[PDB]
Amino acid sequence: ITGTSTVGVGRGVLGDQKNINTTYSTYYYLQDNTRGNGIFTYDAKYRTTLPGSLWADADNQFFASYDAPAVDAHYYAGVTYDYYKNVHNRLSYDGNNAAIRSSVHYSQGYNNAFWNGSQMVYGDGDGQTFIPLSGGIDVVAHELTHAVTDYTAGLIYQNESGAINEAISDIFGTLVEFYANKNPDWEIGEDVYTPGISGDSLRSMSDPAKYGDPDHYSKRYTGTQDNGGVHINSGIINKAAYLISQGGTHYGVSVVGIGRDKLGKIFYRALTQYLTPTSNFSQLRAAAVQSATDLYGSTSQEVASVKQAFDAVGVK
Ligand SMILES: [Ca+2]
Ligand SMILES: [Ca+2]
Ligand SMILES: [Ca+2]
Ligand SMILES: [Cl-]
Ligand SMILES: [Cl-]
Ligand SMILES: [Cl-]
Ligand SMILES: [Cl-]
Ligand SMILES: [Cl-]
Ligand SMILES: [Zn+2]
Ligand SMILES: [Zn+2]
Ligand SMILES: [Zn+2]
Ligand SMILES: [Zn+2]
Ligand SMILES: [Zn+2]
Ligand SMILES: [Zn+2]
Ligand SMILES: [Zn+2]
Ligand SMILES: [Zn+2]
Ligand SMILES: [Zn+2]
């Protein structure tokens, strides 16, 4: 809508206060004019009709319980935009400043969130498995990263390619969470999963086997469930990424960590320049080695650590 750019204030899903970019035209709308072609957040009103109504608020204060998922969807879309722009010189998910549109209060008791090809969609959870899913910055950025992948490599969502697709979204979801300094960690979805249980998450990148997920290629799932193990086998790549950044010794292989920024640069270059729709784990290794070579040189520590990390998780 047309109006005046304003800054409102509200509280997110976890009760934290934050400022949000809004637009004033009689009402204050969750329309951020400061990022690309805009960030727009919508009320789906517990329906499954999308996108719903552009979020309108009478006073630019967003402290109602019903407001909280919208505050976080809007704010964390903005943080994700800022990450890709400031760290990777990428303008929105398509690199062409596409508007980022999000709908909250999707359906009733809905324990999921997803990028649907044109917008983000967030359930509120059932209050036991999940609280509203936009409360997790890593969830928001994980799903928006699926759009990045779709607009670059086009990784197929099945089998090893699909596990790479998932792991890329976990890697950049995590890197966004660190970029924001929003209680960062190497676990996924901890801020919105099981409010009655502290210390858990959907999966761990630093220790996938904490939740039973494989941390080595020899332990990969080979059946047909979960589209051929896309959220299961992602642990193999997630652990390699963790090792590249943080270092460690894994199945006896010592990895010299090179930090988060270099992890992100290596994997962003691999994703955008080298991966293809059917890349497998071995091809991802090659893409990451080539990317680190492009950036740091073939004789660099960075290249040596990429190789170490993929050796540690059994990916040749
Ligand atoms: Ca209000
Ligand atoms: Ca996390
Ligand atoms: Ca929990
Ligand atoms: Cl460990
Ligand atoms: Cl381990
Ligand atoms: Cl480790
Ligand atoms: Cl180990
Ligand atoms: Cl190699
Ligand atoms: Zn998803
Ligand atoms: Zn995903
Ligand atoms: Zn966290
Ligand atoms: Zn699990
Ligand atoms: Zn798992
Ligand atoms: Zn799954
Ligand atoms: Zn998923
Ligand atoms: Zn280990
Ligand atoms: Zn370890």
Curated annotation (Swiss-Prot):
**Temperature and thermostability:** Thermostable.
Please cite one Gene Ontology biological process associated with this protein.
Answer: proteolysis
Keyword Kinase: yes or no?
Answer: no
Q: Name one GO molecular function term.
A: metal ion binding
Q: Which residues bind Ca(2+) 2?
A: 138, 177, 185, 187, 190
Q: Which cofactor does it need?
A: Ca(2+); Zn(2+)
Entry GO terms, CC? extracellular region
Q: Where does Ca(2+) 3 bind?
A: 177, 183, 185, 190
| Cofactor detail note | Binds 4 Ca(2+) ions per subunit. Binds 1 zinc ion per subunit.
In this protein, the active site sits at 143, 231 (proton donor)
The compartments listed are: Secreted
* UniProt feature coiled coil, ranges: none
Chain ranges passing through the membrane: none
Keywords noted in UniProt:
Calcium, Hydrolase, Metal-binding, Metalloprotease, Protease, Secreted, Signal, Zinc, Zymogen
Q: What is its EC number?
A: 3.4.24.27
User: What does the entry list as the binding residues for Zn(2+)?
Assistant: 142, 146, 166
This enzyme catalyses: Preferential cleavage: Xaa-|-Leu > Xaa-|-Phe
Could you say which residues bind Ca(2+) 1 here? 57, 59, 61
Annotated Ca(2+) 4 binding lies at: 193-194, 197, 200
Q: What is its main location?
A: secreted
Entry similarity comment: Belongs to the peptidase M4 family.
- Annotated function: Extracellular zinc metalloprotease.
Q: Return the protein name.
A: Thermolysin
- What is the name of the gene encoding this protein? npr
